[PDB]
């Protein structure tokens, strides 16, 4: 019955992907952003310039107040509100209704985005990082405890129609080839371990611990592929060298300045492919996912005469570890197998195409001492 969930997501990498949900009785419809980087379920419950609609506790007869305040700060953006519970359903998801914790957002700062179309956020990470503390059971945890929905979900994010969030399973019609699994190192963020990095087949030759300093996570709520300072610099130096025959504006490599080319003349060939090797399921075994430039060059509308193809560098620097964002997830079908503490990757049915190259998930590879790649 997963067909009912296929294509249940809308949005793009730049402003996030959202799924339709209902809260309260009678059911109040709201678009909720899918965020594997947090664990709080929260919805705007007060007027805001960027909100076209919001949760009205006053209109719900099943709403219950927890008499507790709460706030959640994010890498970028933050909000505060009042905790409480209510009945939640997912129209284009499993046919069930559960009473889950809900944070009613009363104030926010740089959280809501202009024209994103979503009015709330669905934190799918573990309770360990939920605010105020891990006693506030996350939505997914509530779903699995109150129903027979299997403890796992998968995400097929499609860039530029929309995507799919299969709750409770894996839909084989959404991917090609084999699924490759990497262990979820620890149950807080969806933390993984990168054991090797290559650009155009060239090893970055860095201590693999640098790749996971201070950690590496899979986050649908982040647009870019964010890398620790050391790694980011080496990657840019390598990417620049690969496309040195091209001239780019100032601030382009900072994910700031936009770059354009004549309609259909984007020189993809000058941009290298990036291979991220992830810890595997068996001893001394890893597998790699390959990213095409079509993934790390996020298409953006031309500020003026919208005619040419413009893009923004979708690889940026981080100070809180590696973040495998949407631009990376878009090329694949990602399975968040909570039940077996692992994350699977497979080429997505909606992968972006290239003439002489193709994104891929390949294995097995032998990699010794992978455990030393983890940061402590």
């Amino acid at each position: 019955s997963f067909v009912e969930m296929v294509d249940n997501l809308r949005g793009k990498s730049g402003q996030g992907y959202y799924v339709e949900m209902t809260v309260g009785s009678p059911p109040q419809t709201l678009n909720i952003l899918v965020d594997t980087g947090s664990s709080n379920f929260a919805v705007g419950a007060a007027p805001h310039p960027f909100l076209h609609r919001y949760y009205q506790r006053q209109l719900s007869s099943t709403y219950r107040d927890l008499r507790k305040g709460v706030y959640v700060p994010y890498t970028q953006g933050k909000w505060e509100g009042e905790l409480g519970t209510d009945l939640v359903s997912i129209p284009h998801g499993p046919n069930v209704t559960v009473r889950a914790n809900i944070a009613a957002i009363t104030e926010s700062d740089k959280f809501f985005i202009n024209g994103s179309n979503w009015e709330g956020i669905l934190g799918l990470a573990y309770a360990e990082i939920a605010r105020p503390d891990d006693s506030l059971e996350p939505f997914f945890d509530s779903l699995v405890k109150q129903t027979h929905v299997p403890n796992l979900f998968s995400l097929q994010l499609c860039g530029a129609v929309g995507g799919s969030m299969i709750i409770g399973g894996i839909d084989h019609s959404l991917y090609t080839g084999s699924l490759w699994y990497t262990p979820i190192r620890r149950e807080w963020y969806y933390e993984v371990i990168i054991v090797r990095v290559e650009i155009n087949g060239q090893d970055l030759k860095m201590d693999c611990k640098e790749y996971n300093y201070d950690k590496s996570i899979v986050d649908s709520g982040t647009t870019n592929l964010r890398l620790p300072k050391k790694v980011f610099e080496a990657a840019v130096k390598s990417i620049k060298a690969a496309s040195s025959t091209e001239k780019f504006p100032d601030g382009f490599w900072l994910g700031e300045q936009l770059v354009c080319w004549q309609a259909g003349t984007t020189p993809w060939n000058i941009f290298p492919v990036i291979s991220l090797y992830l810890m595997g399921e068996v001893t001394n075994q890893s597998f790699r996912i390959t990213i095409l430039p079509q993934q790390y060059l996020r298409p953006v509308e031309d500020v003026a005469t919208s005619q040419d193809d413009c893009y923004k560098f979708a690889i940026s620097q981080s100070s809180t570890g590696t973040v495998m964002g949407a631009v990376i997830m878009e090329g694949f079908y990602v399975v968040f197998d909570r039940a077996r503490k692992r994350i699977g990757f497979a080429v997505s049915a909606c992968h972006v195409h290239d003439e002489f190259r193709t994104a891929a998930v390949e294995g097995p590879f032998v990699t010794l001492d992978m455990e030393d790649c983890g940061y402590n």
Binding site: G14, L33, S39, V72, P73, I129, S220, G221
Partner: peptide, 4 residues
């Protein structure tokens, strides 16, 4: 976007 950069979502805890």
């Amino acid at each position: 976007l950069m979502x805890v």
